[PDB]
Amino acid sequence: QKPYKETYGISHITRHDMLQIPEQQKNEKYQVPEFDSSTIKNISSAKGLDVWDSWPLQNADGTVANYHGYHIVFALAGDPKNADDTSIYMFYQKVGETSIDSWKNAGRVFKDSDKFDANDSILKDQTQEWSGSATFTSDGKIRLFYTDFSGKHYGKQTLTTAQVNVSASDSSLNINGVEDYKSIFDGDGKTYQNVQQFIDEGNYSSGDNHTLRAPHYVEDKGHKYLVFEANTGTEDGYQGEESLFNKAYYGKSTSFFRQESQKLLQSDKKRTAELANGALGMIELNDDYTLKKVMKPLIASNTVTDEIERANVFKMNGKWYLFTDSRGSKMTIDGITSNDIYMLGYVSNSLTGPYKPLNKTGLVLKMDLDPNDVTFTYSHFAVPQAKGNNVVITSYMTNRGFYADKQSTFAPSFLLNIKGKKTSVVKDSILEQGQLTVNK
């Protein structure tokens, strides 16, 4: 196969940039701070459930919404014994409260019968509800986006929306039901991989890893978009043997391409690399939240990894910041280990790009604790704030099903300082578990 160069007009997480991270990550400015295990509590209202990936109800610009005097956080929860028990619950606190003990549980967003009542062919085959985002509409409605996972159809993942109907009183919030509950996007094969393409490979035992999830709502100039975890399709640089010869995925120089590509081809990571075609995708939505336009990915991670999760994007002080979480264990980069877990980040003058790496390489956060560590965190997420140079990093703490007495819970939040194309963790900025804003 001859070397070639093709960007497909999109940005790329390159091998060269990733290779810089192992040395860089030793700098405390890019490290999830150490947490104090004796301050950590289970979510008391979640009653022995694991509570992991969690997200705030947001305004269109990503700031935290105020619903009738309450903050709302949606989260995946389930029985610690059953790895396939995953539904979305809605938690809430009065605005002003900070303690983890302030979070009340409104229960599941969905009834089991809702997916059938939706009159939606894909939804009626759902077995789990995976994570997403939620926006607070201009007419005062709670608009949810999440991933419909079908365990019985080879792990199909479909971007899905619903309006959550909630009555508010002085004391409580109550979920009355949902409406406008519908599939929006299941891939198109050319821009984003679909489940059939995964099945064509031999599904799970092929080593391929199909993703179409983590839908994040954002607006710009009154246009509505989802940015999401995906994989590339046939027309924007697909997985395959040929992909290892695309210099766009390497960066730096032809010298670097020749050296790195031949190492990769001689390595035990060649096949993994060939299959690796992660992407942060984008679609525009109509005003009824249906699909308007499939758009090109903002960034892709060909050869590096198949799995870039928890897509997030927002404008802050005149620039756009794009983030994703990713496990070192599924990467193919020398010096990145199975313990390493990252939030990577990119910056643009426009929502639609082009995006270049933060801190030269893409590194924003590094967390490398043992999976057994009670203070292990995952699903790091930057919550934009109304003003200032700080965002709040939320994450879940404690691996699912690991400890009888210590469930997955809200991690202590902390601050990340962002200016220009640089970030730093704010020294001793640890907040309460699950705290969403600096303002109180």
- Catalytic residue numbers, as ranges: 53, 309
3-class DSSP state of 175: strand
- Asked whether position 277 contacts Ca ion by CB under 5 A, the answer is yes
Query: Taking CB under 5 A as the rule, does residue 425 contact Ca ion?
Result: no
> How many residues at the interface with Ca ion, by CB under 5 A?
6
CB of 274 to Ca ion, least distance (A): 9
Distance CA 221, CA 229 (A): 23
Q: For residue 220, what are its two tokens?
A: 């710009």
Minimum CB distance to Ca ion, residue 210 (Å): 7
Interface with Ca ion in residues 16-45 (CB under 5 A): none
Binding mask 166-195 for Ca ion (x = CB under 5 A): ------------------------------
Residue 237: which residues within 8 A CB-CB, separation 6 or more?
A: 6, 8, 243, 246, 248, 249, 277, 300, 302
Among the residue ranges 207-215, 256-264, 342-350, 406-414, the one whose residues contact Ca ion (CB under 5 A): 207-215
If binding is defined by CB under 5 A, does position 236 make contact with Ca ion?
Answer: no
Q: Give min distance, CB of 272 to Ca ion, in A.
A: 10
Residue among 106 and 331 whose Cβ is closer to Ca ion: 331
Nearer to Ca ion, 245 or 402 (CB): 245
Min dist CB 300 to Ca ion, Å, is 11
Count of alpha carbons within 13 Å of 376, Cβ hemisphere only? 19
Give min distance, CB of 278 to Ca ion, in A. Answer: 7
Determine if 275 is a binding residue for Ca ion (CB under 5 A): yes
Identify the CA nearest to 178 among candidates 235, 113, 244. 113
Q: Minimum distance from CB of 231 to Ca ion (Å)?
A: 5
Which one among 11, 239, 332, 398 touches Ca ion, defined by CB under 5 A?
239
Residue 106 belongs to what H/E stretch?
Answer: strand 104-108
Please give the Cα distance from 423 to 166 (Å, whole number): 37
Q: What angle do CA 47, 52, 55 make, to 5 degrees?
A: 110
Nearer to Ca ion, 231 or 377 (CB): 231
Contact 89, 109 (CB under 8 A): yes
| 30, 307, 334 from 209: Cα distances, Å | 28, 7, 21
Q: CB nearer to Ca ion: give 133 or 194.
A: 194
Closest among 55, 36, 143 to 393, alpha carbons compared: 55
**Separation CA 321–CA 241 (nearest Å):** 32
CB of 11 or CB of 232, closer to Ca ion: 232
Q: Is 355 exposed, middle or buried (0-12, 13-18, 19+ CB in 10 A)?
A: buried
Binders of Ca ion among residues 288 to 307 (CB under 5 A) are: 306
Report the residue number, 188 or 373, with the smaller CB distance to Ca ion: 188
Applying CB under 5 A, which residues contact Ca ion?
208, 231, 239, 275, 277, 306
